[PDB]
Short mmCIF file of C-alpha atoms and ligand atoms in Angstrom, two decimals:
data_model
loop_
_atom_site.label_atom_id
_atom_site.label_comp_id
_atom_site.label_asym_id
_atom_site.label_seq_id
_atom_site.Cartn_x
_atom_site.Cartn_y
_atom_site.Cartn_z
CA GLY A 1 100.86 -81.15 115.19
CA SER A 2 103.44 -81.04 117.96
CA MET A 3 101.14 -78.92 120.18
CA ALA A 4 97.57 -79.68 121.33
CA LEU A 5 95.28 -77.07 119.76
CA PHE A 6 91.77 -75.95 120.79
CA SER A 7 89.35 -73.89 118.73
CA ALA A 8 89.14 -70.22 119.69
CA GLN A 9 86.31 -69.34 117.31
CA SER A 10 84.30 -71.16 114.61
CA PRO A 11 86.24 -71.67 111.36
CA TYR A 12 85.54 -69.54 108.28
CA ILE A 13 84.66 -72.01 105.45
CA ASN A 14 85.30 -71.07 101.78
CA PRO A 15 85.66 -67.40 102.65
CA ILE A 16 85.20 -65.39 99.46
CA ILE A 17 88.04 -63.02 98.42
CA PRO A 18 88.23 -60.15 99.26
CA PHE A 19 87.40 -61.32 102.78
CA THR A 20 87.10 -59.22 105.93
CA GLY A 21 85.96 -60.69 109.21
CA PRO A 22 86.30 -60.49 113.00
CA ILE A 23 88.97 -62.00 115.17
CA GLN A 24 86.68 -62.59 118.12
CA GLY A 25 88.01 -61.11 121.36
CA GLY A 26 91.16 -59.83 119.62
CA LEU A 27 94.49 -61.48 118.85
CA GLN A 28 95.90 -63.17 121.97
CA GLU A 29 99.23 -64.78 122.92
CA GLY A 30 99.23 -68.42 121.71
CA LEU A 31 96.62 -67.86 118.97
CA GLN A 32 97.29 -69.59 115.61
CA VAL A 33 95.43 -68.30 112.58
CA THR A 34 95.71 -70.72 109.66
CA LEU A 35 94.70 -69.96 106.05
CA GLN A 36 94.38 -72.87 103.62
CA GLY A 37 94.11 -71.82 100.01
CA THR A 38 95.56 -71.65 96.51
CA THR A 39 97.74 -69.05 94.90
CA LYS A 40 96.17 -68.04 91.56
CA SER A 41 98.06 -69.26 88.44
CA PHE A 42 99.02 -65.78 87.24
CA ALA A 43 99.29 -64.24 90.67
CA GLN A 44 101.01 -60.90 91.08
CA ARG A 45 100.44 -60.17 94.78
CA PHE A 46 98.22 -61.11 97.70
CA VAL A 47 97.62 -59.57 101.13
CA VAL A 48 96.81 -60.73 104.64
CA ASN A 49 96.12 -57.89 107.05
CA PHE A 50 95.69 -58.07 110.82
CA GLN A 51 94.09 -54.79 111.64
CA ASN A 52 92.24 -52.68 114.20
CA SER A 53 88.74 -51.94 112.85
CA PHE A 54 87.45 -51.95 109.30
CA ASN A 55 88.99 -48.92 107.57
CA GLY A 56 92.54 -50.26 107.21
CA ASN A 57 94.20 -47.17 108.70
CA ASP A 58 95.74 -49.27 111.48
CA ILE A 59 97.18 -52.58 110.33
CA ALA A 60 99.38 -54.24 113.00
CA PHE A 61 100.76 -56.79 110.54
CA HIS A 62 100.48 -56.63 106.74
CA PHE A 63 101.83 -59.76 105.02
CA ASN A 64 102.28 -59.23 101.28
CA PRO A 65 103.84 -61.83 98.92
CA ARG A 66 104.84 -60.29 95.60
CA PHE A 67 105.54 -62.43 92.56
CA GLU A 68 107.87 -59.70 91.36
CA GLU A 69 111.61 -59.22 90.95
CA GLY A 70 112.24 -62.94 91.51
CA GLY A 71 109.70 -63.24 94.34
CA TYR A 72 109.74 -61.69 97.82
CA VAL A 73 107.44 -61.02 100.76
CA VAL A 74 106.81 -57.64 102.34
CA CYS A 75 105.88 -57.36 106.03
CA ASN A 76 104.87 -53.99 107.47
CA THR A 77 102.64 -52.05 109.82
CA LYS A 78 100.29 -49.15 109.07
CA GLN A 79 99.57 -46.59 111.79
CA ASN A 80 97.02 -43.76 111.43
CA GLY A 81 97.23 -44.36 107.67
CA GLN A 82 101.06 -44.32 107.50
CA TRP A 83 103.19 -47.28 106.47
CA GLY A 84 106.33 -47.96 108.56
CA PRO A 85 109.69 -49.39 107.38
CA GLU A 86 109.20 -52.53 105.30
CA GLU A 87 110.77 -55.85 106.19
CA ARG A 88 111.40 -57.77 103.00
CA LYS A 89 112.20 -61.49 103.02
CA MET A 90 113.86 -62.12 99.70
CA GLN A 91 112.27 -65.47 99.06
CA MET A 92 108.94 -66.66 97.68
CA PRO A 93 107.49 -69.65 99.60
CA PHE A 94 104.29 -69.81 97.51
CA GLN A 95 104.02 -71.06 93.91
CA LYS A 96 101.58 -69.82 91.29
CA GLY A 97 98.67 -72.23 90.88
CA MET A 98 99.54 -74.28 93.98
CA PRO A 99 97.79 -74.98 97.33
CA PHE A 100 99.35 -73.55 100.45
CA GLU A 101 98.93 -73.58 104.23
CA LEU A 102 99.75 -70.25 105.85
CA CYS A 103 99.89 -70.06 109.66
CA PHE A 104 100.32 -66.97 111.80
CA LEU A 105 101.24 -67.65 115.43
CA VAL A 106 100.90 -64.82 117.99
CA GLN A 107 103.72 -64.87 120.54
CA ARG A 108 104.34 -62.27 123.24
CA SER A 109 107.03 -60.34 121.31
CA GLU A 110 106.43 -61.34 117.68
CA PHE A 111 104.40 -63.12 115.07
CA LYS A 112 105.82 -66.37 113.68
CA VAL A 113 104.72 -67.17 110.13
CA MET A 114 104.81 -70.78 108.79
CA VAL A 115 104.19 -71.61 105.16
CA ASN A 116 103.42 -75.22 104.30
CA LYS A 117 104.43 -76.12 107.90
CA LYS A 118 107.89 -74.56 107.56
CA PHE A 119 108.97 -71.39 109.37
CA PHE A 120 109.16 -68.56 106.86
CA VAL A 121 109.49 -65.26 108.76
CA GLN A 122 109.23 -63.60 112.19
CA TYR A 123 107.78 -60.14 112.67
CA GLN A 124 108.29 -58.16 115.91
CA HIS A 125 105.15 -56.49 117.25
CA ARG A 126 105.29 -52.73 116.67
CA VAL A 127 101.85 -52.07 118.14
CA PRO A 128 99.70 -53.93 120.72
CA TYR A 129 98.36 -57.10 119.13
CA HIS A 130 95.32 -57.32 121.44
CA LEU A 131 93.75 -54.34 119.60
CA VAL A 132 93.66 -56.30 116.34
CA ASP A 133 90.06 -57.40 115.87
CA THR A 134 89.82 -57.83 112.12
CA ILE A 135 91.44 -60.02 109.45
CA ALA A 136 91.35 -58.83 105.84
CA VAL A 137 92.46 -61.03 102.94
CA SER A 138 92.73 -59.90 99.32
CA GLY A 139 94.48 -60.33 95.98
CA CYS A 140 95.48 -63.26 93.79
CA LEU A 141 94.35 -66.22 95.90
CA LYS A 142 91.42 -68.36 96.94
CA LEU A 143 90.77 -69.83 100.39
CA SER A 144 89.18 -73.08 101.49
CA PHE A 145 89.33 -72.18 105.20
CA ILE A 146 90.53 -69.90 107.96
CA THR A 147 90.88 -71.55 111.39
CA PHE A 148 91.53 -69.97 114.78
CA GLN A 149 93.17 -72.19 117.38
CA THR A 150 94.95 -71.77 120.66
CA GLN A 151 97.40 -73.72 122.84
CA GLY B 1 104.46 -66.62 72.58
CA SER B 2 106.96 -66.82 75.45
CA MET B 3 104.54 -65.13 77.87
CA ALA B 4 100.84 -65.60 78.62
CA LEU B 5 98.79 -62.70 77.22
CA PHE B 6 95.28 -61.58 78.24
CA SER B 7 92.79 -59.37 76.35
CA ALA B 8 92.72 -55.76 77.66
CA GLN B 9 90.04 -54.45 75.29
CA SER B 10 88.03 -56.46 72.80
CA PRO B 11 89.69 -56.87 69.40
CA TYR B 12 88.75 -54.96 66.29
CA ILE B 13 88.04 -57.77 63.84
CA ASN B 14 88.34 -57.12 60.11
CA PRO B 15 88.45 -53.36 60.64
CA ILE B 16 87.84 -51.56 57.31
CA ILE B 17 90.80 -49.46 56.07
CA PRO B 18 91.04 -46.47 56.69
CA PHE B 19 90.15 -47.25 60.31
CA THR B 20 89.97 -44.98 63.34
CA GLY B 21 88.81 -46.23 66.73
CA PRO B 22 89.33 -45.86 70.48
CA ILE B 23 92.08 -47.24 72.60
CA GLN B 24 89.72 -47.48 75.57
CA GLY B 25 91.21 -45.81 78.63
CA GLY B 26 94.37 -44.76 76.76
CA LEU B 27 97.69 -46.50 76.20
CA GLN B 28 99.11 -48.17 79.31
CA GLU B 29 102.51 -49.52 80.30
CA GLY B 30 102.77 -53.16 79.20
CA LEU B 31 99.98 -52.92 76.62
CA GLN B 32 100.66 -54.79 73.40
CA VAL B 33 98.70 -53.61 70.38
CA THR B 34 98.95 -56.18 67.60
CA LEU B 35 97.91 -55.71 63.95
CA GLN B 36 97.48 -58.89 61.90
CA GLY B 37 97.14 -58.14 58.25
CA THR B 38 98.39 -58.23 54.68
CA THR B 39 100.40 -55.65 52.75
CA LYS B 40 98.75 -54.97 49.38
CA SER B 41 100.48 -56.44 46.31
CA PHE B 42 101.29 -53.02 45.04
CA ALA B 43 101.87 -50.97 48.10
CA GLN B 44 103.24 -47.46 48.27
CA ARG B 45 102.84 -46.55 51.95
CA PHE B 46 100.85 -47.36 55.02
CA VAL B 47 100.40 -45.56 58.36
CA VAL B 48 99.64 -46.54 61.93
CA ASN B 49 99.01 -43.51 64.16
CA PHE B 50 98.70 -43.53 67.94
CA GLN B 51 97.03 -40.21 68.56
CA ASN B 52 95.22 -37.97 71.03
CA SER B 53 91.63 -37.60 69.76
CA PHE B 54 89.97 -37.89 66.37
CA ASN B 55 91.69 -34.69 65.14
CA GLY B 56 95.06 -36.01 64.06
CA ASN B 57 96.84 -32.83 65.20
CA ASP B 58 98.58 -34.63 68.04
CA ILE B 59 100.09 -37.99 67.10
CA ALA B 60 102.32 -39.46 69.79
CA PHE B 61 103.71 -42.10 67.48
CA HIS B 62 103.35 -42.19 63.69
CA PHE B 63 104.69 -45.39 62.11
CA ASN B 64 104.93 -45.17 58.31
CA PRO B 65 106.46 -47.86 56.07
CA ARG B 66 107.31 -46.47 52.61
CA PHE B 67 107.92 -48.80 49.67
CA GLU B 68 110.16 -46.12 48.16
CA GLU B 69 113.94 -45.53 47.83
CA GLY B 70 114.79 -49.18 48.58
CA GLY B 71 112.14 -49.43 51.30
CA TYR B 72 112.25 -47.67 54.67
CA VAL B 73 110.09 -46.84 57.68
CA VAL B 74 109.52 -43.37 59.12
CA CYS B 75 108.74 -42.93 62.85
CA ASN B 76 107.69 -39.46 64.09
CA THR B 77 105.48 -37.44 66.41
CA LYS B 78 103.06 -34.59 65.56
CA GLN B 79 102.43 -31.85 68.12
CA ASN B 80 99.88 -29.09 67.48
CA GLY B 81 99.86 -30.04 63.76
CA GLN B 82 103.69 -29.92 63.46
CA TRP B 83 105.90 -32.87 62.62
CA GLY B 84 109.09 -33.40 64.60
CA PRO B 85 112.44 -34.84 63.44
CA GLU B 86 111.93 -38.14 61.62
CA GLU B 87 113.59 -41.35 62.65
CA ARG B 88 114.13 -43.43 59.51
CA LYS B 89 114.96 -47.13 59.69
CA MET B 90 116.47 -47.90 56.30
CA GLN B 91 114.95 -51.36 56.03
CA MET B 92 111.57 -52.69 54.91
CA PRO B 93 110.33 -55.60 57.09
CA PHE B 94 107.03 -55.94 55.18
CA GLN B 95 106.69 -57.70 51.82
CA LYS B 96 104.17 -56.65 49.17
CA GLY B 97 101.20 -58.99 48.94
CA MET B 98 102.25 -60.91 52.08
CA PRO B 99 100.78 -61.39 55.58
CA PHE B 100 102.35 -59.66 58.56
CA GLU B 101 102.09 -59.42 62.32
CA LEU B 102 102.92 -55.94 63.61
CA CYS B 103 103.15 -55.52 67.39
CA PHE B 104 103.52 -52.30 69.36
CA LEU B 105 104.66 -52.78 72.93
CA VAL B 106 104.22 -49.80 75.26
CA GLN B 107 107.12 -49.54 77.66
CA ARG B 108 107.87 -46.87 80.24
CA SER B 109 110.45 -45.02 78.12
CA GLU B 110 109.75 -46.25 74.59
CA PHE B 111 107.56 -48.17 72.23
CA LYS B 112 109.16 -51.41 71.00
CA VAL B 113 107.94 -52.54 67.58
CA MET B 114 108.02 -56.19 66.48
CA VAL B 115 107.39 -57.25 62.91
CA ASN B 116 106.76 -60.93 62.23
CA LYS B 117 107.90 -61.61 65.82
CA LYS B 118 111.32 -59.98 65.35
CA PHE B 119 112.34 -56.71 66.90
CA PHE B 120 112.25 -53.97 64.27
CA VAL B 121 112.51 -50.51 65.89
CA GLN B 122 112.39 -48.66 69.21
CA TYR B 123 110.81 -45.25 69.56
CA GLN B 124 111.40 -43.05 72.59
CA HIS B 125 108.29 -41.37 73.95
CA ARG B 126 108.36 -37.68 73.09
CA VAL B 127 105.03 -37.08 74.85
CA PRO B 128 103.20 -39.11 77.54
CA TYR B 129 101.67 -42.19 75.90
CA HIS B 130 98.68 -42.16 78.21
CA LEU B 131 97.16 -39.25 76.28
CA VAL B 132 96.81 -41.58 73.29
CA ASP B 133 93.19 -42.71 73.14
CA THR B 134 92.83 -43.28 69.43
CA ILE B 135 94.40 -45.54 66.82
CA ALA B 136 94.20 -44.65 63.10
CA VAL B 137 95.27 -47.00 60.33
CA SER B 138 95.42 -46.09 56.64
CA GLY B 139 97.09 -46.98 53.35
CA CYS B 140 98.06 -50.04 51.40
CA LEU B 141 97.03 -52.82 53.73
CA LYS B 142 94.11 -54.81 55.00
CA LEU B 143 93.71 -56.12 58.56
CA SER B 144 92.24 -59.34 59.95
CA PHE B 145 92.36 -57.95 63.46
CA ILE B 146 93.79 -55.55 65.97
CA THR B 147 94.20 -56.99 69.48
CA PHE B 148 94.97 -55.27 72.79
CA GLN B 149 96.75 -57.52 75.29
CA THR B 150 98.72 -57.49 78.48
CA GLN B 151 100.85 -59.92 80.52
O1 LIG C 1 104.67 -51.23 102.78
C1 LIG C 1 103.57 -52.04 102.42
C2 LIG C 1 102.87 -51.35 101.27
O2 LIG C 1 103.78 -51.12 100.22
C3 LIG C 1 103.20 -50.30 99.21
O3 LIG C 1 104.12 -50.14 98.16
C4 LIG C 1 105.06 -49.09 97.94
C5 LIG C 1 104.95 -47.81 98.76
O4 LIG C 1 103.84 -47.06 98.32
C6 LIG C 1 106.23 -46.98 98.60
O5 LIG C 1 106.88 -46.86 99.85
C7 LIG C 1 107.26 -47.47 97.57
O6 LIG C 1 108.53 -46.99 97.92
O7 LIG C 1 107.41 -48.87 97.46
C8 LIG C 1 106.44 -49.63 98.15
C9 LIG C 1 106.53 -51.01 97.61
O8 LIG C 1 106.84 -51.64 98.79
C10 LIG C 1 101.96 -50.98 98.62
O9 LIG C 1 101.37 -50.10 97.67
C11 LIG C 1 100.93 -51.37 99.69
O10 LIG C 1 99.89 -52.11 99.09
C12 LIG C 1 101.63 -52.14 100.82
O11 LIG C 1 102.00 -53.41 100.32
O1 LIG C 2 107.27 -37.02 59.29
C1 LIG C 2 106.19 -37.87 58.97
C2 LIG C 2 105.41 -37.26 57.80
O2 LIG C 2 106.26 -37.13 56.67
C3 LIG C 2 105.64 -36.39 55.63
O3 LIG C 2 106.60 -36.15 54.63
C4 LIG C 2 107.75 -35.41 55.02
C5 LIG C 2 108.99 -36.05 54.42
O4 LIG C 2 109.18 -37.32 55.01
C6 LIG C 2 110.26 -35.27 54.73
O5 LIG C 2 111.30 -35.67 53.86
C7 LIG C 2 110.04 -33.75 54.79
O6 LIG C 2 111.04 -33.07 54.07
O7 LIG C 2 108.77 -33.24 54.40
C8 LIG C 2 107.57 -33.95 54.61
C9 LIG C 2 106.72 -33.17 55.62
O8 LIG C 2 105.44 -33.09 55.06
C10 LIG C 2 104.43 -37.14 55.08
O9 LIG C 2 103.78 -36.34 54.13
C11 LIG C 2 103.45 -37.43 56.22
O10 LIG C 2 102.40 -38.25 55.73
C12 LIG C 2 104.18 -38.09 57.39
O11 LIG C 2 104.54 -39.40 56.99
#
């Protein structure tokens, strides 16, 4: 790519869905988390959660494509079990049955999300990202890998 | 059909008339219950009941073609053993001695009923459909199967 990238932790290979695993040392500025997978052919929704601990009460960034109402993606945060105000991007960048690359880049003030190498959405941090130590992936997809790389 | 359909409960194959059997877990929004069969050559009436329990005292939706008075179909509900106001469609979409496909689609506000792939009647829910856990079929027909499907 246009930036030299270094591994920040060993890749997850063929992680089985639903997948939950550590983000070693927490999210950090300049970290890129890339998921390579396939949207199921009759997909309804899928979810990628960046969260603090295992119970899901505190999700810093929930990324939720919904193959509903013409296709849209919900971004939100959960705090102490409570969902905040949704940010809906009224566009579906995934296609049922098709491979995708999904990249989350941690910047100081926001996440940047790229889908198939193209910027899709930004999401301002609502909570401290460094407390996110867990990624959780679920729903109508499969994954071939999850990589963790830094500039 | 125009939409992919998936089994929700195994089919009842060649169920013997009169038939009564579970709708496992109750009727659900988006469930399509399809009866594939043949109207007897000399048919007087047949009945499909969506009901709460084996008793027959509470029938959410009673669908009753009558080969009488030109041919017509009665739709009604039974509560605590009492019939409500009938809804009569003054048309007979079944032909004596001929195959038919009869499909009940459960929607949020109504059942939609298709006969031979053409819309026949709507029936507003008078009671919650989810309490229906039993289907009962009787009268002048035979069935090759009953399927339970969803999108
Ligand atoms: O905000 C992310 C979550 O949305 C939840 O969906 C509901 C929510 O329960 C309620 O606010 C309602 O108004 O609409 C929302 C649809 O956005 C999902 O159930 C949950 O899985 C998250 O995606
Ligand atoms: O409403 C459904 C039931 O109708 C019963 O017959 C009715 C009849 O249609 C109506 O004209 C009224 O005056 O009296 C009857 C009530 O018993 C059938 O006997 C029953 O099988 C259902 O189809």
